[PDB]
Amino acid sequence: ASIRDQLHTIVYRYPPTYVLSSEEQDLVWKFRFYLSSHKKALTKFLKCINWKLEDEVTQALWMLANWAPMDVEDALELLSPTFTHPQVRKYAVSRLAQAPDEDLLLYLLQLVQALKYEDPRHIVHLHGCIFNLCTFLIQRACTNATLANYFYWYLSIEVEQDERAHDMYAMVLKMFLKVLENGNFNLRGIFYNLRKQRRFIDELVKLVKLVAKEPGNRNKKTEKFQKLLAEQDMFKVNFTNFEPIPFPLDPEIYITKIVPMRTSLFKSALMPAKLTFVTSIAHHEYAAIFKHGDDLRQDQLILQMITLMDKLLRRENLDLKLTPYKVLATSSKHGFLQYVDSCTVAEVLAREGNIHNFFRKHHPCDNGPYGISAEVMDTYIKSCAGYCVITYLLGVGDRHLDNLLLTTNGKLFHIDFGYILGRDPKPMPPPMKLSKEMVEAMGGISSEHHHEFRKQCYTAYLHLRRHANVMLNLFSLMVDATVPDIALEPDKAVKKVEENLQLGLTDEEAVQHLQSLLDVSITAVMPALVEQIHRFTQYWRK
Amino acid sequence: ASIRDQLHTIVYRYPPTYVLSSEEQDLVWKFRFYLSSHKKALTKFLKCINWKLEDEVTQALWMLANWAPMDVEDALELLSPTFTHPQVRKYAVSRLAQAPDEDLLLYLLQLVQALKYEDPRHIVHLHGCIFPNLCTFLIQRACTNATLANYFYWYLSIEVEEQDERAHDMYAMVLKMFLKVLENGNFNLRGIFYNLRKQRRFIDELVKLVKLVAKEPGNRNKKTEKFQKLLAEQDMFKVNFTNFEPIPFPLDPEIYITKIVPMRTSLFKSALMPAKLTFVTSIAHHEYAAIFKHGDDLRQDQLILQMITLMDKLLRRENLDLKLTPYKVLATSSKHGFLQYVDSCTVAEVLAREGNIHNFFRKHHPCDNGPYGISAEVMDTYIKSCAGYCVITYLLGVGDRHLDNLLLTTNGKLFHIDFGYILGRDPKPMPPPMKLSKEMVEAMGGISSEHHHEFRKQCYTAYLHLRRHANVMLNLFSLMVDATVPDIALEPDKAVKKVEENLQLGLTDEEAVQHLQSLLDVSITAVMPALVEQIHRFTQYWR
Ligand SMILES: C[n+]1cnc(N)c2nc[nH]c21
């Protein structure tokens, strides 16, 4: 029938997550033989025939083999725990094989997690062989230098009933380094580079340990810091100059040396340092942060997430001017974070009671809406929208004016991500996090900009909804991940992101929903709208 | 061209009211000769022509004669004051003539208002013919049907009683003519005249009695005991109240009276105290009751009721039945009136007599299973009565709503009453733009109910439907510019713009629902105590 097609159109588009109708699950089977139509169908297909054990399986592998080629995201689902079978893993891996390197890089983080899934036998035999997914990751790590660095750092962290999963990761990392040694010139070139990175990290850790060990005023500890860096050959490789190393946090950039005098130390109780590095070429300086206190895996997942969303949005050709900095954690309790010149909002307010005066110093225009360049305002509005919607989907907690930073450009971003998926020290939300100052920085509900802001939020939300599947699959693979917040309710953890997505709603409904949350959050923050609500309560009483 | 049609379809649906048309009328004209596509087009076509060239008028006139015939609702615009010219007005009347009596009756109230616009010399000449076109039309029809005669008579009578000076004389002449046509006419015309005479005499005695009751010192009970005695006292008055010669009730000509039961008569709580009455019906003793108010001008409440009745009619046509109750008012001459009495209990009474609304439905209609041990239909009718009213009071700007002021019925329905404050006039400083007591929201089961969600959904569909049918509502309001309805009279012009603004015709539907959703959200948050606290916590989070 022609109508059944609309109901099929329904199933291929709607879920990445359906359990629904393990009775209808075979109606698809009946029309699929002809409607091996397009890519998406196949993932849905595999979910049901597999439940029954045996003769259908052999028929299904043929069916799959002949099926229109799968998109990559299906493959991420195929690598998940749900399907145990090897051929489908093989198929999923051939899809990744088709994927370009940059794509692996984003996905890559989960793929390392994906290794936890079978088969150990595939791992044991490769290991036994020198003394399928794992094999593929290694080969492609060896093809690309940047890829190899990230692969290495992720494995080093996993090795640093989960004891058996550790064991496996250890075997996989060690093989990887061994193939590089046995390597032809370029592999070995990468290998030596990895060894060089590590040595350096270990030296910077040792310096930090010794900086922490002296009790002090913050200034005293910066003074001490500058002296240790300046001081030569007490530390295996001098810090004021060393052989050029490609930054571990960013492979593309090489570093010759740090600069001591430039380094300043952060207000946070456990104190990360800003360091200045020099690029191998043209004496560019790179500024990074080196944090000593906590495991950064959580911050980095969020950052990968943001990156993904921005990418899709830009592929949408909405640039919300998201400013997603790279984060890498070396070990649990050391990491590097990109640094972008920025002022924390609270700082701005101490420096200036208003954000607009703050912009006014940097990009003033006379016919400009407010004494700001029109384009700055637009960029500010967009960055807020993007970030409200992203935090929302991600259910980020603990926002405060120290947490959100502003650039002279107007981009707005969030710095610190200790609380994910709604976890929060405080007892209530708001679900949408906006300072009063930021809404006044928009010029309030009356203003035209604020309306543009709201408008952007909805449309961003609508788009992300469309690419539901990628985010859910990536998360599907963070269950066993060791992010503190996932670990508490891991099973539940995937559902929370999907709840925020509200995929159940038709679009108009979805926009309405987000409008709702916007209204609550804005009214709460503004003092004038709170007073108006009180007059309305007042009205029914008498 | 191909798109031009679309700009024009946009012009045709969107407003009936707009002065918007400026260049558009000139481009539209070129197309008028080629396509009188639609009935709607005719109203749009009419707008451009008359002021300028007189010959231009001849061309437009020929155009209209063969033009796709106008819908009755649009015709009303024509009787409206903005269009002076005699030939178009004749056309409006011809369109009304085709209309069936019931639709004709619903509008009847406005026509009397419209009567003001037709030139008096047209009316003076008709008077001239009898004593030693629309006005003729109203009388001709008023005569053909008794119920129409009755309504026409009461509306005119209210108007006749002492700028106003010229309009009073006009109405008086029309009435005198209508009465002379009936006495003169045949049997039915005479029959109508006789029944009208009975109605008139009956009310007057009814009024004498109410006046005696009011003088008497005492609280309500002392006064009701007194009222009970007078009806029962035969022969104090011209009419004997315990029995009479049957009279068509002014509220329903369809039903005669014949009796009143003194014992059944009560009075209400409200400030000037209306009696209930009962009568027998002319047939098999079935009672009727109505109310009867001694203390103000009902005109405003009747317009509002006409408005609610019509809106309900439109929604039923769509097939939304929100179980509205559009009870009947007529005024008599201002300061008496009647109102149909529907059995109901005011919410405040319901809360005191039974702790909460849920308990109240539960006692009358209890089914252990669903949803609240309250039979489902009742819940559904309560949800629907609720949606229909917030939307309708909101469009109409009904204000001064209180618990004393809404009612329930055993059946579930909710409705309003006593529309003294209209069009955003309020005795208080604020809205809320939507009127929901907490008591009512709890009745729904609060924010997450299938039922509360159901109510919001019902409101949205209702809003959109009314949005589509805006043309009729605006035309009727335009017709009561000169209304002598207090709230409208404060600024006559603003009244029409205010109902229109509430309408949100500019917005796209997706936006319109967002706009309505917004108004509902502030209104419910302020009403519920938990939500206010949630907001306080959110304020607390930041600073
Ligand atoms: C400027 N900046 C950028 N990224 C961070 N993670 C950060 N923390 C403090 N300041 C910061």
Ligand SMILES: C[n+]1cnc(N)c2nc[nH]c21
């Ligand atoms: C109780 N009651 C019922 N129906 C009415 N129309 C009315 N008006 C005031 N009170 C009322």
